[PDB]
Structure formats: structure tokens, C-alpha cells
């Protein structure tokens, strides 16, 4: 899953 600040 993408990191919290990735999107």
C-alpha cells in the first residue's frame, strides 16, 4: 500500500 504522504 502507498505511504500516507505518497498520494
Amino acid at each position, epitope marked *: *500500500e*502507498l*505511504d*500516507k*504522504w*505518497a498520494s
Partner: antibody
Amino acid sequence: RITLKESGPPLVKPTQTLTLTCSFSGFSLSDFGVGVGWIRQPPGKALEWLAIIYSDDDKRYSPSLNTRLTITKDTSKNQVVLVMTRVSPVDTATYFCAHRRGPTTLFGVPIARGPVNAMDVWGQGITVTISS
Amino acid sequence: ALQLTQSPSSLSASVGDRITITCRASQGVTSALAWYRQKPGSPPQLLIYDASSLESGVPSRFSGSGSGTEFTLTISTLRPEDFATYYCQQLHFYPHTFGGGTRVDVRR
């Protein structure tokens, strides 16, 4: 100005529940985007990521340990707790809690995310042994 | 999970020397990569964040670069306190993961 300190039992028996507490100062877990994570280091091995919890109560766990880990925060007491159930000697290691910066803000407005890409401050760590 | 491979696993060097450690990810992690230094009996310490940014208080001899799947950490002039183990960490994907570490010892 940021300090983290881990506390818990130095020895636990297999099948028991391990409870670790991270007490910190220098920052609030109520600050935008800030996070606190746990990382372990088994004897003579590499670092292993366990979980992280953020100011907005969002939280994530290492998938392989998902069912045994639970992380919670207490903003009022400046503490983060990690609970691990059904421990085994495989869990023997030094456990560290660490701070993760939230995005940089200008007058309260998020401007850059770069500083979140790291765990900038780590506690001294606590060594926990699981054995009967 | 995302695999991080550090190389070399072990490195021999002398004070004053220039060394470079590489980290390779199984897939792109953009610039979400950090480097830490760890001395025996102590916790990891942040050197570089976001692939190339120098953490405040860290000596200018440390530098980092790269993006995507290839990153490097460099110490221009090695110091006595630099003989330790170094680790990379990616924070682009959950779970965050660390490389296997790189130990730097005294050459002879």
C-alpha cells in the same frame, strides 16, 4: 528538543502479551501529520519495521504481524503504546520507538512533504527477551 | 513487501577515505529514502532524508543521491566515529522496510 523513551518488561514468557510504552517530549501527537513508529532489531540482525500511528489516529502495521500487533496513542499523556500478543522467542530483540515528522507548514499550511521521508529521532531502545 | 538491497554488505576503509554505499529497491520508491548510521550499543541516527536532504546537525561530509530504485550514500572524508553500520529505509510503501545494513570497519 525531541526525546523518546521506551519502557516495558525485560523478560516475557512465550504465549504472553507484551506491552511497550513510548513516552516522549518536545512534540505533540496532536500536531498535524506527526507520527510515532516502532522498529525492532533482533540480536545481530537488521532493523525491522513494526507499526506507526499518526496524529489523526490513522495507523499501520507490518502485514505479517498484523494479527498480533495493536498500537494506540494518548495525546494527553504524550505516550504511544504497542501491544504484542502471543509472543515467542522469535520476538526477542531490542525495540525502538521513533518520531516521524509531519509535512512542513507555513502559518499552518502544508507546503512540503520532504521532511516526512525519514524517522528523525529514535529512543534509546529497550531489549526484550522471550523465554520460558 | 518492497525489498531493499544494500551493497556492499561489508566494507573496509581507513580514516580520511571516501566511501559509497548503495541501496537498490525492488521497485520505484520515488525519493522516499532515508539513511541512518548505527554505532554498537546505540540506536540508529538519521543522516539523510528524502534521498538527498541533509538532516540538521549532521556533518556536511555526508551526502545522498538517487531516486527511483537506485540510491547512494557517500562520506567524503571518513572519520573515526564513522566506523559503524549504515541502513537505508524506504517510506514510499507500507510496510516501510529497511535494507540489510552495511558495516564499515577499519582496514588493515
